[model samples]
Target: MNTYFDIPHRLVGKALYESYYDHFGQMDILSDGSLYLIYRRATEHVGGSDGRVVFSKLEGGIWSAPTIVAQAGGQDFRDVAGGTMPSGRIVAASTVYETGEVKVYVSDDSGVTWVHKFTLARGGADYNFAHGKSFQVGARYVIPLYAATGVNYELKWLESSDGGETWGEGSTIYSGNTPYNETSYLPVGDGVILAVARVGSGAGGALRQFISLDDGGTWTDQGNVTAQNGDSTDILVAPSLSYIYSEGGTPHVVLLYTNRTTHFCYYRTILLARAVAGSSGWTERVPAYSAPAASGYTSQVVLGGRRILGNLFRETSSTTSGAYQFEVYLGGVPDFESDWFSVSSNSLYTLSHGLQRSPRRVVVEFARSSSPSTWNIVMPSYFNDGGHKGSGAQVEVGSLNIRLGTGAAVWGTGYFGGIDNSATTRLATGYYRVRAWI
Candidate 1:
């Protein structure tokens, strides 16, 4: 239960700040309690050569309209990075993919005004998508970069000891060349650091882990966390991944990724993994959120109380006209009492639309004294064509069963019923229950 917080499904919908169709982005919270969001605005689908970075601000639960942070100077400025430094300075960075140039910006008055500091051209590789958190390590600030350099992509680090004024030539740590691209890292101790990265493409693509015991000097691989063999596709163009430190009962380094567990598809569900400080293995896989169409490329930020605020690039459909847009969403587990609603009479319970997207264990409990009670429980549909799969259910005291039939393809729509029908056996003066991640 300490895996993920049971937060709401949707915080903000798609295309709120539509300039040229936004995509590939993340979220950050400054020291002043304000939120900043940045993404790429493209003139065409799949991000043509005219891609640039744009930003939006959220204050008091409201998001401002997006404004251009940087333009694509002769090359697509993709994989932009935005986060607050330890000194309350708001910084944004972007890379010119074709020119292999990296640009950095700073906003002094809380994102009100901005100024470009400097740029770095690391070889001829695309040093875009600096996905990791830019943090202060000792007297110097360290930021991880996922760049496609030389033969293959590499995991590198860039340092700025003089307070974001200038940066040093990045040190390449993991140069596997298997497209170990977008990455995020957390400083666990004095010299020990834990990092997660996107490795390979679909089919062969997986979420890999690494450790740096000598600050940002060296790194060692820890194998794959989530293998992509079951994914729908092997093409990992815009894969999204994010990680953050959650401090409460136990210090945790939580990871969120667009898992490719399905066919060779794009982002299917945002799966989660949590690792306690100084530990090895992580928790079992848990669904952050799953939609009918593709919803991947996620970024998560800690919300103090084991709760997290996440951003998603959700695809509304699978067709050519299907629009893939950015959305501000929320997820985590619920911290409260689980009181079963009394069902003395014949009734029906349906999981919320968001819950149905990513089915969770739903339970029904009762004590029947008179006669054996019988009721039908419906499992939500998850696909379009057919074979509406059941999420699986269990019973404590009574027999539970499911039967699949033809009906609406999507759940929580006009046809309000599960693809399978569940029945339970009545009981005496004892307690009976049904449960499943509906």
Candidate 2:
């Protein structure tokens, strides 16, 4: 019950940091293109250490150490919400259980440092929480805040037009009297917003959909969506919805949430649903399921361009939820190949993959430069007696391009170039192809 098309690599954990449960995670990108993840550090999904809101930066390909963002003396802090402004300000907000107030924190230097911004989302903290993401429409800032008075909960859009300097009127999107939890909001540019909320009663609830076109002014209930995996009942909660650009600037909506495969535990799998822009159809894929252990409120953010980063709740070994990073784009697996590059036994060459990021898999193949029959995927090393075989012995991957072989390795055409043990006599003068993907 999984997809092997994309592989996830952990970005942080107990091995990567101190021991703690770092779940209820979310991410954001700075105006300078820097990416970071913010999550709740606690004992379990709930108490023990109460909870502390902390964040880590994704520098180069590595995640920096966790740094405190917000924490009350003896209260839980979650549905930790916030994200980047188009002008670059980073914001974080959530309900503080101790003070019963929804507080806000802002970072001007891309989260390197933060300052207490404000509190009071025009409402209460009685069972109030929000997702760790915000939306931008033109110059206005929008935040999805859910408030509860007893069991009667409502989702509202708290907006700021003058760069979050002052508060404006609060706009109600859905009158969710029974569903009392978080909803992820994504502004797909031109004032269009897409939302997915955790609805129904307890654990096995439905994931309700809502769409807006007037910058989240009014939300239209798109009805309940059927999210299933094998015999895993009706399950979808802690929805972290986002919109990203794919193909040649085609927009796509991706929903990341925790799903249950059985009736036990909080959540079993962290699943993903992707659809083209406003199309009602979606392709459900699982990037991780029951791996670190049980799953809970999950989140993801676009790491610059097409790559996404997240942290899944796992209660094993140490209460640690490591960041998982992978690429998810529409129009098929984000694959591309280079125009055949001419090569020789001693020539070195370079070509651009243009993927905008270093791909998970990359290969260089060779074909006869003259007649061109079968293509051979070249290898870096081979069983050598006389010498190396292939025209080139190494290939390197860059964010946008690649280098075939090094100054020490030289370039070549195909693998069989030295299979005959006579590299000088083999038909080594041929064409090469480089392919890469997620």
Candidate 3:
């Protein structure tokens, strides 16, 4: 179980303007290695304002300068974030009405232009897919939430299959007089779905968790994921799941969250756990990272062809120096404490032909400087695998490079990562090859 995260210091990015702060709900990486970063001005900053989306590319492990995708002022819209469609259309799920309604905006041109997709009522609107928990089942989109039915703020689920054409099904998954937020949902098999909700519905309504299996129909009460008295504001109510191929063939789920408490001067502590997909329910919760005074959120992706969980967090440590951090926490099928290998080189060139979720090792055989040092290698993340409409067939990690050599080096290791086969399976069933970006 390789529990800790290995952040390639140079590969991550930092926040630019305060208005474009990459909070929990406004950033998504497309199948083409391009990213759409959503931006907004919170009420805590500008007495409540508007939200916008910015598009960028990830080349050579670097994020390109973001371009404006969509914008709204006054009652138009605000604080958008979500993933890109197989059609390359960016889905911008947003929070608006000051905790009332969630809006979905769609962009056609890689995020340059957008149109209002649809709107749904959920817990005053503050409980939309806050950060990186949106999924697509077959042609249907699953958006989980904490909704209010004028009687109770219940954990609910929403679906849209016709590419945001319309949305009306709002199924209440959990219905007690409890405080629940942070919802994550995934379609398992057939009509069955797995939904996890963070609940605070105890006698005193403390921070807790709940899981629903029948597509937001029935729920099983799991006691507090965090201690009853522990800080819960930073905790994610919903859990993310994936079938890992890197760690053998065992299917496991990576549970990521934070505990917001008064300890350590009020900073949030991050926690993670790796559990077998059907292991009685997750009984092994491990502590990840804890940044006191800084708010953190997590998102998982099966990018680079393998199954990988990514956590992009923001340090709300200061008003002026609010910095954002992005890192990938690879999971072993058995535990997060397992180990995997990360190789690199000095004077080298690596170009990925297709996605490598289960790449044995990054084979590197460097010759003399005089030799033509051009080799076709496999990077990760479905960026440029000869597709046009966001087809993820290249590397499962990131893009390759013709890096220069201070020394010709090669690194190798084991496979301990996995991706969401459900998403991958759905993506493959559609459009054949969308884009020809090779």
Candidate 4:
């Protein structure tokens, strides 16, 4: 019998702005106490399907409205991944779904604006690259991913040294006939890196881990977390894991993943696992959080203390007919301040004991609480809109409706083609309360 474990977790917040169709991306903490979010927005237009790279950031509990990072006219960018360095340079990686070329974008101001760096083609005409997360190695950055050369996906690592200004030859880590794609990893301690990837499909689909002693130069397979059930078709699955080493007397690592299972139909179940000192291998898969139809590809980051911030993609309804949604959630040992609370324009809001932040500038705001506040502010392309900044802006303890546009406080400002006041809107009367936070 497979061992089942239970871990306590609760939903903290969800994104108010969701595309009709979206997929999993990545999350990273910047040097200035801000959290960066990257995801792809897939839509069906007049001609055909289209995709664009969207970027956003969370500060003081409030997520800045998303800004389009990249859109190659009619091209599709899938499986996006990104990371932020301590020096505030952000690198976002994705693959041209059609051309099979690796596209890299760099942002110097913490994901606010991005400029295309360069495109690198690794394999021959038959091979195509997919998106994967990038991590810093001393002064260099390394991104590991599997490319479809023709038949099966082969895993390779791409390294950059000049702060993403240039690239180097690809390094082959695992080249075999397996669907071991969609990989992510983090450095454990003492030069040890633990990698988690999705291997196989259908009933054989499982989440596998590999340990590297030489900083991903070499790897040793550590076996699967979700073992095969010895049957095909009945249990088709795909999983993605994001982890961080938990600090304490015990050597523990906390992990979150979307463990999707398909018996009648495919559905996602988000689960948590902890590899402790005395535990019998990863504490028997505990439940973390799940969405309406499907939930997997969970990306997580530890924010000092015992608090963790994560997000996953899911459908909006129990049935498969709902629109796709991506949600940001919170998980910890004890629990968050409360289940998902909301604020409204009719009343003043306070979190009682405000959330603790390692850095002072990090504010807490909410766009979508548990109950869906009266009015959630949606700032379309705020990052692209010029003149939005600090100084005049203050991170209040609790509130919403930022000060911007024509000197009158407005709920949101929409911009198109660098023209101001082209499209703008305000909060409904008696609905001016700040809705969401960081």
Which structure among the candidates has the greatest lDDT?
2
Question: Local error of candidate 4 at 180, Å?
Answer: 0.6
Per-residue lDDT of candidate 3, residues 115-183 (tens digit) = 777777553433454334666666676565555544566665566777766765556667666666566
Point out the worst 10-residue segment of candidate 2 by lDDT: 263-272
What residue runs in model 1 are displaced by over 4 Å at the alpha carbon?
A: 1-19, 45-48, 124-129, 226-248, 260-280, 291-295, 317-438
- CA lDDT of each candidate? 0.51, 0.59, 0.43, 0.51
Q: Each prediction's Cα RMSD?
A: 12.5, 13.7, 18.6, 20.6
Looking at model 1, residue 290 earns an lDDT score of 53
Query: In model 3, which runs have C-alpha deviations exceeding 4 angstroms?
Result: 1-21, 39-70, 76-81, 121-132, 149-151, 188-192, 200-209, 212-214, 226-243, 262-290, 304-309, 316-325, 329-331, 335-438
> What tens-digit string does per-residue lDDT give for candidate 2 at 226-274?
3222224545566776555544453555666665544122222111222
Q: For every model shown, what is its TM-score relative to the native structure?
A: 0.62, 0.62, 0.58, 0.61
Off by over 4 Å in 4: 1-11, 44-48, 59-62, 226-247, 262-280, 292-294, 317-438
Using TM-score as the measure, the top candidate is 2
Q: Which ten residues in a row have the lowest lDDT in candidate 4?
A: 263-272
lDDT of 1 by residue, 1-438 (tens): 353544332354433444344556667676656667776667643533777777787654556767777884677876667577778777777777676677887777777777888787676764544654466667777666777755776777777878788887565768655877777676666876666666656345456667677876876776665421233333333333333322223244555556545312232222122232222334333454552334455665555444456665554434211122233222333211122222321223332322223333344434332123333343333332254432212222212332122222211222333523222222112322333333
* Candidate 4 residue 52 C-alpha distance from true site, Å: 0.7
Error of 4 at 266 (Å): 15
